[PDB]
Every structure is written in structure tokens, then in C-alpha cells.
Design a protein around this nucleic acid. Structure first.
Length: 129
RNA sequence: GUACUAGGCCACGGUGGCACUGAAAAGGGGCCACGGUUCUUAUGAACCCAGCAGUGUUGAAUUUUGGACAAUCGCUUGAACGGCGGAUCCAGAUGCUGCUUACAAA
């Protein structure tokens, strides 16, 4: 009941009403700003620490061209098929950036010796790491 | 609705006219006239990069006077992995891109 909210219900964790019984007037309502989209792209790149445009753009078109069920459990599946997120799922680093340095050493051993594609992934199902 | 990719077909080879041969006609085949470029002791001859590189003007801007027949593919030759091809294949300079890139050591 409390948990498992809607996957796009992130407007309940930004500003709320009828749960704050004080300050009846002067309540901040959200304006028409696209800066939350730009900072959400910042939340996307900060989960990779990578240069802003090219990687998230290339993963965006790959996420469109892979399958067409939806864009929410599958676009983050395109995020999750990437190798630095995959290493963070294994737990070989404190965070994504340290894992990126570890793969920058080529300490990693994806599919035998090394990933053939270091910056882009993409780990298909059936690929050892 | 509008600049390219590669490739289909046509047209043209400084300009214009025409012919041989060939089954079919001419981009480094033949003849004449033009317009250029050089030289003559001036009488006349030689040549025509919209082939490759390269030069010069203009341009905001335009590449190396590279290697090679080995791969094709073509032409040719009955030896000979033969001969040739600025087609091509490989390298350069140069926009776009996809893709890596810390060294040490087995």
C-alpha cells in the first residue's frame, strides 16, 4: 500500500499539499519549467559520470531500436545492459566512477579476455563478465 | 520540399564541318576551317588535361608531380603465377563519422 508507487509518480516526492496543515496561503505551486528535464538528464549522466551528450544520445536511439514494449522498464534496461552499471550490480567498486576507472585499467574480463566494445556495452543475455 | 552518397541511362571532349575501317566510331585515331600557346632566318610547323598528380587566376575553401600489378577486372599472349592498365588496390593531405587508447612485465 505505502510502497510500490507509480513509476512516474515522482511529483509526490517534490511538492505536497493536504499533508501540511499549516501555511494555507503562500503554498508553492510548480511553474512551467523544463529545467527538471535537464536536471533529470543530469541525474542520468551522473549515474555514469560520462561526457553528457554522445553516450546518453547513442543509448537513447539504441533503446528505441531494441524492442518496442514501452520506454520505462526497457529504457532503464538499456541503462542496465551497459557495462559500468553491470559492474555496479556486481559490486566491484564503491560507485560507478571507480568502476569506470577499473575498466579504464582494463582490469575487467567480460566474455573471456576483454569487452570488444569498452565505452558502449552492450551486455546481451548470456554474456559472462 | 529540396546540395552529395555508390550506381542506371544520355550527352560532350578547346569550337565547328566531314570521312575511312569496323557489325557498331572515334576522350591521348584521319583531313580541313576557327580560337588559343610557343618558335622562325616569318616562309610555316608543333600542341589542345571536362584522364592522374601538379602549376596559375578567381574563390572563404579546395590533396601527393606516392607505390604497385600482387588481389580483382579488362586488353593481350598456347610456355613462363607471362607483359600492361593514374581502372583499381594500397598508402598520403582533408570535412564527416565508429572505435580504441596509463605505463610496466608473461
Amino acid at each position: 500500500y505505502w510502497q510500490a508507487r507509480s513509476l512516474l509518480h515522482e511529483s509526490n516526492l517534490h511538492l505536497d499539499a493536504l499533508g501540511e496543515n499549516p501555511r494555507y496561503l503562500r503554498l508553492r505551486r510548480v511553474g512551467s519549467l523544463f529545467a527538471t528535464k535537464l536536471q533529470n538528464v543530469r541525474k542520468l549522466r551522473l549515474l555514469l559520470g560520462f561526457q553528457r551528450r554522445g553516450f546518453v544520445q547513442k543509448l537513447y536511439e539504441h533503446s528505441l531500436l531494441a524492442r518496442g514494449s514501452d520506454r520505462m522498464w526497457k529504457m532503464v534496461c538499456a541503462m542496465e545492459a551497459t557495462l559500468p552499471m553491470t559492474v555496479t550490480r556486481m559490486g566491484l567498486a564503491e560507485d560507478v566512477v571507480g568502476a569506470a576507472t577499473a575498466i579504464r585499467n582494463d582490469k575487467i574480463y567480460v566474455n573471456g579476455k576483454q569487452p570488444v566494445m569498452p565505452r558502449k556495452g552492450l551486455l546481451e543475455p548470456g554474456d559472462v563478465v
